[PDB]
Design a protein around this ligand. Structure first.
Ligand code: NA
Length: 227
């Protein structure tokens, strides 16, 4: 076998649930599983390099890294320094309601209710504008906003569709459902250095295949649950 080993350098954020987080002395998450599955098909060898989002692109610029799979969302401004592949996840804001809440079904059914959000999120603006709330409970951590819904001190919560789902699944055990569809949708994608080009198209085809194959659904169930 000698040293024909692929020097592919992969990079992720130190802490970022539920995509790349440390659990059981091993980084775990959706993005890790995705790159593992892609590799199987592409038959390439990877070496995850953990760093702060601050240096992810800066590094890709000098190609100190050859690929990066964090929560990089497709953005044309950034394309001046890097290049993205077809997205692997639909981002956006979702609405959690107690499962027994069969009255609310969407964000427009919230006019005149209590919606819990987190400070420094995009949930605030959408609500400050597209929504007519009798009260906006801006908490500094969603965990507490989840309590409010659990104590029916709020009618529903508004936060990233990924997060709301992980919890509906992890420590959800009912009394928590999702309604409607992801608002302000975006797409998450792998980021390849400008120099790399075929490696990109190769990975693009790989993702088309795995989504064509559809094992993504099972991985989706493991993290974000049933679509
Ligand atoms: Na209740």
């Amino acid at each position: 076998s000698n040293a024909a080993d692929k020097k592919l350098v992969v990079a992720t954020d130190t802490a970022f649930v539920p995509f790349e987080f440390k659990q059981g002395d091993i980084y775990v998450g959706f993005d890790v599983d995705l790159w593992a599955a892609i590799a199987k098909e592409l038959k390439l060898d990877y070496e995850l390099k953990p760093m702060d989002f601050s240096g992810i692109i800066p590094a890709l610029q000098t190609k100190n890294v050859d690929l990066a799979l964090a929560g990089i969302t497709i953005c044309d401004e950034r394309k001046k320094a890097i290049d993205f592949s077809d997205g692997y996840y639909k981002s956006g804001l979702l609405v959690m309601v107690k499962a027994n809440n069969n009255d609310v079904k969407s964000v427009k059914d919230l006019d005149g209710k209590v919606v819990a959000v987190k400070s420094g999120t995009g949930s605030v603006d959408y609500a400050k504008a597209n929504i007519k709330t009798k009260d906006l409970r801006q908490f500094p951590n969603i965990d507490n906003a989840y309590m409010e819904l659990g104590t029916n001190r709020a009618d529903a919560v508004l936060h990233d569709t990924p997060n709301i789902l992980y919890f509906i699944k992890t420590a959800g055990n009912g009394q928590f459902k999702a309604v409607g569809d992801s608002l302000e949708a975006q797409q998450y994608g792998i980021a390849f250095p400008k120099g790399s080009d075929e490696l990109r198209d190769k990975v693009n085809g790989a993702l088309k295949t795995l989504r064509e194959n559809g094992t993504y659904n099972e991985i989706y169930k493991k993290w974000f649950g049933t679509e």
